[PDB]
Amino acid sequence: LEIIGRPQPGGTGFQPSASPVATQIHWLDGFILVIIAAITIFVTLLILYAVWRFHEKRNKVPARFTHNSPLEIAWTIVPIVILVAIGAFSLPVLFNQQEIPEADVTVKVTGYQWYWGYEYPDEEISFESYMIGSPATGGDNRMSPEVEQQLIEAGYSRDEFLLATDTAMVVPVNKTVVVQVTGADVIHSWTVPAFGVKQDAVPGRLAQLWFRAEREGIFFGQCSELCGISHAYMPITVKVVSEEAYAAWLEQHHHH
Template identity: 65%
Template sequence: MRKISMLTGLMASLLAAPAIAQDLEVVGRPHQGGLGFQPAATELARDLQWLDGMLLIIITAITLLVVALMVFAFIRFNRRANPTPASFTHNTPIEVAWTIGPIIILVVIGAFSLPVLFKQQEIPEGDVVIKVTGYQWYWGYEYVGEDLAYDSYMIGQPYTLASEDEEAGARPYVFNDAMEAKLVSAGYSKDDWLLATDTSVVVPVGATVVMQVTGADVIHSWTIPAFGVKQDAVPGRIAELWFNAEREGVYFGQCSELCGISHAYMPITVKVVSQEAYDAWLAASQEDGGYVDVRQFLANS
């Protein structure tokens, strides 16, 4: 009965999509000339960004100290100021200081960085488990325990262009008016060119998501910067990462391991939605192979 209701709702959504479809906010996107991190959408990302800031303070302090000591030595011990150099070869207090000092710094860094590393590597039980496989040059997703698996290609790859797209002037890997129209019809903007995919990973907000990552041919790497996650996809091995997205929206990533000629055209799109929208999308996608647009369920969630 629930499936019938879902399918009925899907048909109604398809007919009324322009009227009720709601687009998600794009949160995790690179920006032209950007120097900082993307907004952190998980606890892991916040921890990593805080750790990066702390290390930057330590590195800056060390650099300033070294520069100050060098300037002091240049002024105090140059030939004019010190024409008769000393003949000693050892200074025990200084040698002890430059041995103990770095040890203390490394202990402090380890005390803060190791807990972050352990939090990343200790994989919790997932509310949603997805197996992701890297191919040359697209991603395959399988929702473990659910009857759902599909592939994800960058919009603009030949596989994503239908005959009507080509008749409208769309060409593989070429951004023009026809390609922009195709992006807009899929719910993206021209700023998402080379980032948007024809299908997305859809997960519920606030859920623990475990990704089982592997490769089918060469080494790829699955990463979403706003989540603070990155894991190499190695053929013959399965590695895991996890995240718990705290904010609904669209997040982008890229394959981060050089994997061949089309490595640059292997983006990742994750859409974080409400639990209600996710449940409706999952039920409809199980009937349609994952190609149901989750936007159809957002207006009613």
């Protein structure tokens, strides 16, 4: 499987999109980015021009105006127009994001200090997922020869340290996955950047997110609410596979 959902060295952009929701985030952000880069360049050029043009050596007698109604009207309305426009594209995207559709696959995720527990209620599958290199796999949250060996054995490399877990959440491609998220002890937060999803795992609450993965591969997230000493050490691995490979994985878990 191709490692897709990961940070890349020296990266400045988003992680690759692997869901329609992530795609909408990339587009909306790209749209707002153009606008805010314009605002920033505009304000910067204005400051720099003003300082050159009205420097005391060049403009020896200062003006005294404190008003310009047409300008004050223009500079109030224009911001309002910009925000209404952003909100016009932004609200539908939010609605798509937060309206939970009918699930093809249901996973219940529970955050613990410091690991994730996964349950597939339709399949009677449950398991826990620890960082490769956590005390659970014999390590102590640092790279070592033993840890590199375990990463390799699991189908990864030294570069996936802090991201790769001993077990992955496996799902079929092009299917609607609904994830139900809660926390067992403190608040954690479950996320996969490539899917455009994030949901706090609050003890006593069950919250829902959805994604539909549009290509197969390996996608990582990391716990996104400070939860104690090993907050930095409880990541998320999702493997998106064919329907048949997903079935095969399901059968591997079936006890006869």
